[PDB]
Amino acid sequence: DTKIWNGMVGELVYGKADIAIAPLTITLVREEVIDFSKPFMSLGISIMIKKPQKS
Amino acid sequence: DTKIWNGMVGELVYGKADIAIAPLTITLVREEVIDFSKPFMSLGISIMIKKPQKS
């Protein structure tokens, strides 16, 4: 409704922070409001399961 | 010696091509001469072996 970026983006768009070195997902809506560097950590959705156990 | 980029970079730096949509490794020496987009295909050096031959 207010279309206010909160968080670290709201600290970068509104000038409260000079840069954000943090785990931050580069999305297209975040791309248009702040300039990202090239990604240092490629990742994605992964599968966490228990380790198998003898039974 | 001549410090001439060949290839598609030599087609982009020297204006012979307007854009390069191609499999192209984003390196730092290539970053300074042409502007890359954010990477669409994260990858790296992988291990190709034969499939096991259980018979």
DSSP secondary structure, B1-55, as one string? ------HHHHHHTTSS-S---S-----HHHHTTSPPPPPS---------PPP---
Size of interface A-B (CB pairs under 8 A): 13
List the 16-55 stretch of B: residues with Cβ below 8 A of A: 26, 31, 36, 38-39, 42
Contacts of B24 in chain A (CB under 8 A): none
CB atoms within 10 A of CB B20: 14
Tokens found for residue B40? 């669409």
- Resolution of this entry, Å: 6.1
